[PDB]
Amino acid sequence: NKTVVVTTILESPYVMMKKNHEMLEGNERYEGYCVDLAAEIAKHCGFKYKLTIVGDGKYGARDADTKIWNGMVGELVYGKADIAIAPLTITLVREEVIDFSKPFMSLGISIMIKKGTPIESAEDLSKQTEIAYGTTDSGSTKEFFRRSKIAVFDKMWTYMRSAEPSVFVRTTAEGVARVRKSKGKYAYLLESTMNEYIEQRKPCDTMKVGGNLDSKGYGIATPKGSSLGNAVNLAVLKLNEQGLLDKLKNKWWYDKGECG
Amino acid sequence: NKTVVVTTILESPYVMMKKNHEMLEGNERYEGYCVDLAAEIAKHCGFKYKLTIVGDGKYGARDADTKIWNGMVGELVYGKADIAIAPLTITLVREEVIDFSKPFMSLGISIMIKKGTPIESAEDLSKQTEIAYGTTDSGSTKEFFRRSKIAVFDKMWTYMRSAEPSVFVRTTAEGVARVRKSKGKYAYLLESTMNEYIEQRKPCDTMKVGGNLDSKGYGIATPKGSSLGNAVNLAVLKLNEQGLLDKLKNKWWYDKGECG
Numbered sequence: 001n002k003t004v005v006v007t008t009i010l011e012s013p014y015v016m017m018k019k020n021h022e023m024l025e026g027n028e029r030y031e032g033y034c035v036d037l038a039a040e041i042a043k044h045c046g047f048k049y050k051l052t053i054v055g056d057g058k059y060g061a062r063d064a065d066t067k068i069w070n071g072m073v074g075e076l077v078y079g080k081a082d083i084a085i086a087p088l089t090i091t092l093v094r095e096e097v098i099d100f101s102k103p104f105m106s107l108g109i110s111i112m113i114k115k116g117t118p119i120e121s122a123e124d125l126s127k128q129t130e131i132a133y134g135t136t137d138s139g140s141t142k143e144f145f146r147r148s149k150i151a152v153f154d155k156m157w158t159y160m161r162s163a164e165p166s167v168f169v170r171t172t173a174e175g176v177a178r179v180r181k182s183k184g185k186y187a188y189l190l191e192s193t194m195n196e197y198i199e200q201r202k203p204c205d206t207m208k209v210g211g212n213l214d215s216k217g218y219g220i221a222t223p224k225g226s227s228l229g230n231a232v233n234l235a236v237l238k239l240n241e242q243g244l245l246d247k248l249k250n251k252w253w254y255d256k257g258e259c260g
Numbered sequence: 261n262k263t264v265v266v267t268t269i270l271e272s273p274y275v276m277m278k279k280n281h282e283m284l285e286g287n288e289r290y291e292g293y294c295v296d297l298a299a300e301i302a303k304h305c306g307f308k309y310k311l312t313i314v315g316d317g318k319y320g321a322r323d324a325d326t327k328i329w330n331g332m333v334g335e336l337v338y339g340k341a342d343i344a345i346a347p348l349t350i351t352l353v354r355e356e357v358i359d360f361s362k363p364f365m366s367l368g369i370s371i372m373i374k375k376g377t378p379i380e381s382a383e384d385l386s387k388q389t390e391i392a393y394g395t396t397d398s399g400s401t402k403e404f405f406r407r408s409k410i411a412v413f414d415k416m417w418t419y420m421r422s423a424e425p426s427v428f429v430r431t432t433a434e435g436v437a438r439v440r441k442s443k444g445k446y447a448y449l450l451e452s453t454m455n456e457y458i459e460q461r462k463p464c465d466t467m468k469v470g471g472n473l474d475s476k477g478y479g480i481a482t483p484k485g486s487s488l489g490n491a492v493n494l495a496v497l498k499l500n501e502q503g504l505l506d507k508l509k510n511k512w513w514y515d516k517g518e519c520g
């Protein structure tokens with residue numbers, strides 16, 4: 001038995017530094033949905049682990065020129081980590097290089113606006129220019145727009161890829177800050193899960209509008225051929241069946257919601 | 261290359277006999293969401309196939325005494341079929357004996373009532389006796405209640421397992437007929453997907469109430485170790501990414517909805 005190296009990302013409310021993190025060591029420094037999930041998975045699979053934050057702060061994308069994978073995906077591909085326990089979207093391109101457990105959370109791409117912004121759908125965004133809109137870099141949302149053959153999403157892609165100044169952000173935190181400080185002139189395309197969490201955080205000035213653009217899920221990832229995959233997949237199914245995953249979502253999204 | 265034997269179930273709107281089925285042969289006799297899905301999967305994976313309806317008309321459950329698997333699950337386990345393309349729920353007990361692709365549809369257990377029935381939640385059902393309620397036999401919904409540790413669902417299970425006359429039905433069709441003919445005295449616990457489909461079918465006398473009890477998905481299943489699994493999983497992800505699965509749901513649930 002060896003300590004399993006877990007790669008994850010600082011993304012609220014999945015993994016966050018505890019307020020008193022300076023007083024603590026190792027795994028105890030962190031808290032969140034994925035921190036709780038990691039503890040449950042490890043217990044069910046019988047392994048000890050070490051939580052580590054992805055070096056480049058990215059989810060995972062492959063460079064067009066170099067063909068090299070970055071982010072958490074890259075850490076699994078190059079063997080820097082043994083497993084990824086984070087809001088990592090199950091996609092075809094990633095499934096080609098790493099393995100995923102069945103989903104532990106269901107979600108879809110959505111729109112976040114500053115309250116009062118006159119936008120109710122992706123269709124609305126695509127038909128105008130005054131309100132800028134973008135996505136996070138190196139993730140599944142940007143890749144969705146890049147590869148979409150659907151007219152509305154492709155129209156949106158053509159605008160976003162050449163928009164000036166850049167409409168892309170490095171992290172969810174940056175996109176949220178841009179929505180909040182742009183006086184309604186910036187809308188942010190992000191996963192419904194993040195959108196719903198932020199909607200319940202002070203200053204309660206944002207909101208999710210329209211239906212989700214797609215239906216997909218987050219999965220726990222392991223390098224291809226990992227001996228860990230099977231047990232991890234069964235653990236996820238068990239936790240879902242026990243209602244534990246639902247309990248964890250309520251805990252981190254709503255029980256402590258700050259917007260009444 | 262050999263013809264792949266597909267096991268499926270006659271369940272609207274997934275697989276149904278075409279009205280003019282007598283005039284047709286083989287795969288052409290059927291139509292529906294899963295019929296369309298099977299054609300797409302076969303095309304993407306490069307195989308020819310034969311659609312067959314599960315002999316016992318069941319989804320799949322293991323006998324407590326004999327330990328023998330029935331339904332579509334049983335057909336894969338005993339090698340009577342090469343793959344299952346139907347609304348087969350991904351569960352822990354099934355994952356122990358067969359393989360599943362990532363989900364092609366997202367859903368949850370829900371409540372179906374005859375319009376006007378004074379029930380808005382599972383909590384409501386559990387606190388009364390006048391309105392009987394049950395589930396389909398040999399499926400994931402009955403197993404959910406049987407294994408639940410959650411107070412409300414366990415209370416519901418204790419009532420259902422000993423209710424008289426029996427509250428369990430053999431098929432969705434039977435449960436729907438019971439809801440419709442029981443004058444509000446029977447509520448039916450079934451997957452949200454089936455519930456939403458029936459809600460748009462004449463005589464438009466049923467409705468889904470409350471939130472879903474859980475969050476899970478349907479997957480394409482193959483016997484353990486099947487050489488088909490990998491390609492099938494990637495095909496499902498591709499179809500989802502192209503928006504084809506969403507298009508298919510709209511086609512079979514709403515485009516031809518009969519309730520305005």
Ligand SMILES: N[C@@H](Cn1oc(=O)[nH]c1=O)C(=O)O
Nearest residue numbers: 059088089139140141190191
């Ligand atoms: N879970 C996403 C990361 N990301 O979060 C969003 O909200 N959009 C986006 O791309 C991924 O795995 O790439």
Ligand SMILES: N[C@@H](Cn1oc(=O)[nH]c1=O)C(=O)O
Nearest residue numbers: 319348349399400401450451
């Ligand atoms: N998809 C279910 C079958 N079934 O359909 C429902 O609506 N409930 C139920 O158990 C299964 O795979 O067992």
